[PDB]
From a paper:
R pyocins, on the other hand, are related to the P2-like myophage ɸCTX, and contain rigid, contractile tails. Unlike T-even myophages, P2-like myophages and P2-like tailocin tail fibers consist of a single, large, trimeric tail fiber. Specifically, it is known that R1-subtype pyocins require the presence of common Pseudomonad outer core L-rhamnose to adsorb, whereas R2-subtype and R5-subtype pyocins require inferior outer core α or β-glucoses. From this alignment, we concluded that R pyocin tail fibers are composed of two regions (numbering relative to native PA0620): a phage proximal region of high conservation (M1-A425) and a distal region of lower conservation (A426-R691).
A region of the R2-subtype pyocin tail fiber of P. aeruginosa, PAO1, spanning the distal region (R2-NTF; 32.2 kDa) was successfully cloned, recombinantly expressed with an N-terminal his-tag, and purified by Ni2+ immobilized metal affinity chromatography (Ni-IMAC). Crystal structures of the R2-NTF were solved by selenium single anomalous dispersion (Se-SAD) and molecular replacement (MR) using the Se-SAD structure as a search model. The overall structure of the trimeric R2-NTF is a barbell-like protein, with a three-domain organization consisting of a “head”, medial “shaft”, and “foot”. The head (G443-M525) and foot domains (P598-R691) are globular and connected by an intertwined, helical, and fibrous-looking shaft (W529-V597). The shaft domain has 8 aromatic (W529, F534, Y539, F545, W547, F557, H562, and H564) and 8 hydrophobic (L540, L550, P559, L569, L574, V581, I593, and A595) residues at the oligomeric interface. Of these, H562 and H564 form an H-x-H motif in octahedral coordination to a large divalent cation of ambiguous identity. In our R2-NTF Se-SAD solution, refinement of log-likelihood gain (LLG) maps revealed a peak at this location differing in displacement from Se-Met, but consistent with predicted scattering from iron series elements (i.e. Fe2+, Ni2+, or Zn2+). ICP-MS confirmed that these metals are associated with the R2-NTF. However, synchrotron fluorescence x-ray scans were unable to detect a strong peak for any single metal. Although we are currently unable to conclude which metal is present at this site, R2-NTF structures were deposited with Ni2+ bound at this position.
Numbering used by the authors:
A (entry chain A), B (entry chain A), C (entry chain A): 443 to 691
Write the structure that this text describes.
C-alpha cells in the first residue's frame, strides 16, 4: 500500500509503540490512552508516523497535539534507541541566558562599592588626618607645647658658661649669674650683670678671692641691685678681687 | 506515483544527496556507505525523505538512525541551502546553563572573605590598639613617664619667684630658697623657709645688704637649719638686714 | 487518495493556513505570497504538510525554504495551538553560553588586582615604615634627641643630694657642688669636690657654720679652684667648720 490521506487508524489504550512496526501513520486522540500504553515519548495525545525502511530499521516520529514537542527514534538491529525530544521556542529562549562574551567583572551587577580588606600594612605617611593620642603612643597634640604637656616634659635650660656668665631655667624664668670685680680698699664697686634680669634681681653675695691677711677684716656685701647693676662692697683694708653671684627673673 | 509503505530503495555507497531529487523516501543502512557519499548531513545511517515540490524547490529531511539528530534542507533555484541540525535533549540541557537572572554579585560562588586593598589613607582615629614605638615617630608608651623615658626628657622645674621664695628641680628634688631677715647687732635671728625642705636642708649662706661701715666687722653666718628654720648670725655692730639662700631636698 | 509524489498544489497569495485542513502537501513558492496570507509560521516560502487525522485533530508542519526553521502545530477541538519553532544550529551554539559549572570567582575574568576597601581599623603594629610627624601627634624622629628637638624638651638633671654632693643641669653642663671643711684658726684648708668639674670651676663661697664670737672677725674665702680642689680660708681666731658651694662645668 501507500501512505493514504486518511490515517491508518486511531490508537486506543494499551498500545506498545514498540509493536508499531509497519509503515503508516496513526492518531492517538486521548492523553489518557497514551498513559495506559508503553514507549510513548510523552504522555500526550499525538500523531505517530512509522517508516519501516527494512526489518533492521524502523523509524518513528511523534508530534504532540498540544505542541509539547516533536519526537523521533529508530529501531536498529531489534533495539529501540531512545526518543529524541526537540528543543523549541516554547522551551526556552537563548537570549535569556548569559553569553560567555558577557561574563566579565564590569558586567557583573550588584558589585559592592567597597570591600572588606584583608590584613595589610601601611607607611605612616598614609595617616593624613587626626592627632595620635598618648594611649596609642602619640603626644596628643600638633604643637610642641601641647606635646610637652601631654607627657609632662620641661623645656631646656639655656646658659653661657663663661668665666662671667649666666644660666637660665626656662621652665620658671629663674636666672643665675656670676662674675668678678676689682674693689678698692674699704669701699664699693659697681658690677654690670652679663645679661639684664628681665624684671627683678632677687639676691646675690660677694666672695673674697684673695689670701686676705689674718687678723684683718675681709667682709663682703651685695646690695642695691637693679635689673642690670649691683654694688659690691669690700671690707678688706686693701684693693681686692671679689667674685659674686646673683639670681632673679 | 505515491509515497508507498515500502521505501523506494536502499541507498548504497557513493550517493550524492544532491542527485536525490525525485519525491520519495530512501534508507541508508550503513554509516560507512554514508561516508563514501556526498552531502550527507552527518556520516550516519539514516532515513532520507525527498519532497520535490517543483523544479525550483526540492526539500529533504534526514533522520539519523542513532538519533544523532534530525536534518533538513532545500534546493532553491539550483542551489542547495545548508542542512539545519535540530537541537535536541541529547545535545544539552538548558538548566545546565546560567540564566541572566542568576548573574549577580551575591549569586557568584567562591567569593573571598576579604580582598587585597588598594592604596588608601586613614584618619589617626582608626588606630585603635597598640603603642607606636620610637622607630615610627611614637613615644613607645601610654604613660607620661614612659614617654619621657623613651625620648629621655626631664620634667618641668617649679618655683615661686617672689622677693622671698623657692625654686625646685623636680628631676632630682633639689630645692633652692631665699629671703631677708632683720638681725640685731652682734646677734642671731631665726628665719623660716618659704616652704619646708621635705627631708633635709643641705646648706646656706647670709649676705650683708647694707653699706656697712668700713673698718668694722660685718661677718655673717648660716647655721642650725632644720627642714623649716635656720639661724642667721650678724657680726655687724648695728642692726642690719641680711639676705640668705638655702638649698636642700 | 494518497500522499502523491507530486505535490497537491502551489499555495498562491492570500491563503489562510487555518483553511488547509485536508491531508496532503503544498508548496509556497513565494515569500511575498506568504506575506499576503494568514497563520503562516514565518513569512517565508516553504513546504506545508497536512495530516488530517480526524475532524478533531489536524496536524501541520512547515519547512522554510531557506532553512529559517521548521514549524509544527495542531488544531484540536476547533482551536489552533500556536506554531512551535524548532531551535537549530543556525540559531545559536550552546558552547557560546556560560555553563553553571564555569560560574565562580576564579573563572570570572577582568577582576581587579586590588579593591577599594571599606572603613576599617588597624593595630599600630601594622605601621611598618615612616616616621609620624608632629602634625599627626608624632615626635617627628626615630631618635631620642630628635624627638626632644621636635617638641622642645630638655633632658633630666642628675644629682647626688648627700650631705656633700653635686647637682648637674645636663641641658647646659652647669654643675653645682657643696660640702663642709674643718679649717684651722686664721688659716687655709683644702677641699676636694665630690666630683671633678669636667673643664672649669667658675666660682664658690664659704660660710661660717659656727656661733662665732661677736666682736671678732669671722671672714671667709673661696679661692684657687682647679677642676678637683679649692682653698677655703677662715678668718675666725679659732678652728671652725665652714661650709662651701662651688659651680662650674
Ligand atoms: Ni588600611
Amino acid at each position: 500500500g501507500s501512505f493514504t490521506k486518511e490515517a491508518d487508524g486511531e490508537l486506543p489504550g494499551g498500545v506498545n509503540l514498540d509493536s508499531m512496526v509497519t509503515s503508516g501513520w496513526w492518531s492517538q486522540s486521548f492523553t489518557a490512552q497514551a498513559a495506559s500504553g508503553a514507549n510513548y515519548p510523552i504522555v500526550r495525545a499525538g500523531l505517530l508516523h512509522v517508516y519501516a525502511a527494512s526489518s533492521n530499521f524502523i523509524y518513528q516520529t511523534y508530534q504532540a497535539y498540544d505542541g509539547e514537542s516533536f519526537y523521533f527514534r529508530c529501531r536498529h538491529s531489534n533495539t529501540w534507541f531512545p526518543w529524541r525530544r526537540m528543543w523549541h521556542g516554547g522551551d526556552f529562549n537563548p537570549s535569556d541566558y548569559l553569553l560567555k562574551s558577557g561574563f566579565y567583572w564590569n558586567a557583573l551587577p550588584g558589585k559592592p562599592a567597597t570591600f572588606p580588606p584583608s590584613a595589610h600594612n601601611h607607611d605612616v605617611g598614609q595617616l593624613t588626618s587626626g592627632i595620635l593620642p598618648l594611649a596609642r603612643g602619640g603626644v596628643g597634640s600638633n604643637t610642641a607645647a601641647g606635646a610637652r604637656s601631654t607627657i609632662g616634659a620641661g623645656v631646656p635650660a639655656t646658659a653661657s658658661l663663661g668665666a662671667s656668665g649666666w644660666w637660665r631655667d626656662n621652665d620658671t624664668g629663674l636666672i643665675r649669674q656670676w662674675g668678678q670685680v676689682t674693689c678698692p680698699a674699704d669701699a664699693d664697686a659697681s658690677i654690670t650683670f652679663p645679661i639684664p634680669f628681665p624684671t627683678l634681681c632677687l639676691g646675690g653675695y660677694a666672695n673674697q678671692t684673695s689670701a686676705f691677711h689674718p687678723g684683718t677684716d675681709a667682709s663682703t656685701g651685695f646690695r642695691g641691685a637693679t635689673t642690670t647693676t649691683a654694688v659690691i662692697r669690700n671690707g678688706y683694708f686693701a684693693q681686692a678681687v671679689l667674685s659674686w653671684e646673683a639670681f632673679g627673673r
